[PDB]
Amino acid sequence: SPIEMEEQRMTALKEITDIEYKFAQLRQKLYDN
Amino acid sequence: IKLCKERLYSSIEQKIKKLQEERLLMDVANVH
């Protein structure tokens, strides 16, 4: 179904995007330390 | 001893500047 696939792919994008967010602040705090 | 210490320190500050350019590219990477 197109609705199922749409919500799935956007969920995965939000997933890896918040991964990017927290790994970026990982870089930030490691830089600080 | 002065020359030797400050030579190795010049190398280690080129290390710190390595990390300067590191956070330059991650500066544009956070600007992303």
Curated annotation (Swiss-Prot), chain A:
It is found in: Cytoplasm; Nucleus. It comes from the Eukaryota. Component of the RPD3C(L) complex composed of at least ASH1, CTI6, DEP1, PHO23, RPD3, RXT2, RXT3, SAP30, SDS3, SIN3, UME1 and UME6. Component of the RPD3C(L) histone deacetylase complex (HDAC) responsible for the deacetylation of lysine residues on the N-terminal part of the core histones (H2A, H2B, H3 and H4). Histone deacetylation gives a tag for epigenetic repression and plays an important role in transcriptional regulation, cell cycle progression and developmental events. This is Transcriptional regulatory protein DEP1. The gene is DEP1. The chain holds residues 171 to 203 of 405 of the full protein.
Swiss-Prot record, chain B:
It is found in: Nucleus. It comes from the Eukaryota. Component of the RPD3C(L) histone deacetylase complex (HDAC) responsible for the deacetylation of lysine residues on the N-terminal part of the core histones (H2A, H2B, H3 and H4). Histone deacetylation gives a tag for epigenetic repression and plays an important role in transcriptional regulation, cell cycle progression and developmental events. SDS3 is required for the HDAC activity of the complex and for the RPD3-SIN3 association. Component of the RPD3C(L) complex composed of at least ASH1, CTI6, DEP1, PHO23, RPD3, RXT2, RXT3, SAP30, SDS3, SIN3, UME1 and UME6. Present with 105 molecules/cell in log phase SD medium. Belongs to the SDS3 family. This is Transcriptional regulatory protein SDS3. The lineage of its organism: Eukaryota, Fungi, Dikarya, Ascomycota, Saccharomycotina. The gene is SDS3.
